[PDB]
């Protein structure tokens, strides 16, 4: 229900580059996403999708909230979003997650 419209996107990006990214890659056995099934159309939308994939259980993967990258993500949102606060099927989910973060990190004009 929470819209990430009022979040501090620049700060969350900085948090990703400094911490969350490394925990994603290590969880991915040292690999980076390149077949996309999920996308995002803007920074508020990306965080909505990142929220769902990171914390909500889906039919195919249990909640990743216990994972390191997930706790780092929870931390970043708690600070910068006001009012906010391994199976083959899970690796596929986290790879989609790297894809969303990549889009979220895109340069401003």
């Amino acid at each position, epitope marked *: 229900m929470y819209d990430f419209t009022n979040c501090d996107f620049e700060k969350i990006k900085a948090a990703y580059l400094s911490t969350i990214s490394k925990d994603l890659i290590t969880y991915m056995s040292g690999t980076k996403s*390149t*077949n*996309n*099934t*999920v*996308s*995002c*159309s*803007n920074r508020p*939308h990306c965080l909505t*999708e990142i929220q769902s994939l990171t914390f909500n259980p889906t039919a195919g993967c249990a909640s990743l909230a216990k994972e390191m990258f997930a706790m780092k993500t929870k931390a970043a949102l708690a600070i910068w979003c006001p009012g906010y606060s391994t199976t083959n099927k899970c690796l596929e989910q986290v790879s989609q997650l790297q894809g969303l973060w990549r*889009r979220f990190n*895109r340069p401003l004009l």
Partner: antibody
Amino acid sequence: QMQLVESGGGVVQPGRSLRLSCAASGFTFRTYGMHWVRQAPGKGLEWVAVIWYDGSNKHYADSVKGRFTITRDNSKNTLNLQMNSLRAEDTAVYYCARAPQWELVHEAFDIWGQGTMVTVSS
Amino acid sequence: SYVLTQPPSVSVAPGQTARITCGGNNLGSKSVHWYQQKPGQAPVLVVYDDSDRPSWIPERFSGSNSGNTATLTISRGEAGDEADYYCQVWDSSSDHVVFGGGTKLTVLG
């Protein structure tokens, strides 16, 4: 497994109406912009319409604006094109394709439907 | 209304490199995508964002965008590369998706 399957095509007379459907599967439909592209026999590709991921904005080519209506259902993963007041020049194969959006930019069409034939003739 | 111009036809001998150009006003400022369409089939994305390949595409296909000219290069042309090729951009000024006229690639028999 990522697919777009179309239907609704057929033969109608000028001035009549037609409603095309497109069924997405194997991907999160509600996070992608959806487009309609048409191709007259022996001619090139012509963009027709677009609807944003959340159904918020609908944009058309001038050649169909005011006659065609694009809609989507993100709970049913369905795209539609309501074609009113058809003319001979609307005769074409109609494709649907998905494309990521980023802000106001529409990106590459990575998945296309198989296409449905629409013939406007008496 | 933005305009992309392609040659209607390009022919190549088997094993030789094919080059299909796409011309437009300040085309280097836009992201150019390329589509392949074999007779009777739906178009297939072969290149996006000027020079990036989808997973399902041979390394033979390569794109480039500079000045007022985008170019799709197909190394070691195979008979199976015979198809119509369309360049495409999103024009932000007119808010239209614009396709080129299309180029028929012929591998000479």
